[PDB]
């Protein structure tokens, strides 16, 4: 293990601002070489509860690390290529107490946005963490609930998500398994079209001025050469007992689909998540401009039609290749 200062030299540490959180830990934004990055920091191996849950062991955190790498690498592949997952810059195992400058950032977020986490000031100098440094992906879909232009943007978002998931299905038999709207990131792009390749066939997607990145592989699954990497949630109580959002039904529906056998490949889970996201787009998102032109009213009708038909597709690949929305 390395000290925090290895990952976060002084100027980089000074520029850290907290941008997100979960039971897992903390996410900070900073900058190096003029380029923003997101730093995900997860305590591991220790006995303390953190945000009410036990810390993962090294063995338990490895799947997320491996999957983050494999998905990042899709941006440079040939037959199955997508930039729709987040870039991974580095992963380190760090040892130390939590840096005071990160506690200062933590406090600022707590004062302005409020936090559901414990202030991370109780770790000793032997504490281990995993620090994952990612590309900065923009703002999550949930925080953009009231910020998008029109449902035309929603179409581009769904098309990008479907294409990324398809390429990952084809390359890695990938299932995301936790693609709630906190895990769909949006960034401005000056590209008019985005490019992907699926089983050696290249295509494009109109960007509507946004690039989508999918994040957070804590519950994800994939395989290479029959070696499966996944999170076995077969004995988890709480994951399947959520209420108040269609998100929590997706966990249940995934368990129905796979008969509680999480090592298996069931790409229908990607379809379930895409259905949940389509549902968010039609029910919870609110757009600055409503559908007023005939072209835009046809877009709304097509997204509604996608919502009511997509559950009859077997995978994100089947949706991309066969759904009328993407013709
Ligand atoms: N790479 C990134 N770029 C930008 N924001 C990021 C990330 C990552 I990793 C996470 N987040 C933000 O933190 C929240 C919790 O994962 C997410 O919901 C999101 O708001």
Q: If you had to describe this structure to a student in words, what would you say it looks like?
A:
- The structure is a monomer.
- By secondary structure, the chain is an alpha+beta fold.
- The protein folds into 2 domains: 136 residues, Phosphorylase Kinase, domain 1, CATH 3.30.200.20; 191 residues, Transferase(Phosphotransferase) domain 1 (Transferase(Phosphotransferase), domain 1, Orthogonal Bundle), CATH 1.10.510.10.
- Helix content is 34%, strand content 23%.
- It contains 9 helices and 14 strands.
- The strands form 5 sheets. Strands 1-2-3-7-6 form a 5-stranded antiparallel beta sheet.
- It is globular, with a radius of gyration of 20 Å.
- The relative contact order is 0.13.
- It binds the ligand Nc1ncnc2c1c(I)cn2[C@@H]1O[C@H](CO)[C@@H](O)[C@H]1O.
- The ligand Nc1ncnc2c1c(I)cn2[C@@H]1O[C@H](CO)[C@@H](O)[C@H]1O binds next to strand 1, strand 3 and strand 7.
So what's the overall shape? globular
Helix % is 25-40%
Total count of domains: 2
Q: Which ligands does the model contain, each kind named once?
A: the ligand Nc1ncnc2c1c(I)cn2[C@@H]1O[C@H](CO)[C@@H](O)[C@H]1O
What is the N-to-C order of secondary-structure elements (H for helix, E for strand)?
HHEEEEEHEHEEHEEEEEEHHHH
Side-by-side strand order of the widest sheet: 1-2-3-7-6
Subcellular location: Nucleus; Chromosome; Cytoplasm, Cytoskeleton, Spindle
Protein name: Serine/threonine-protein kinase haspin
Family: Belongs to the protein kinase superfamily. Ser/Thr protein kinase family. Haspin subfamily.
Domain Protein kinase: 13-327
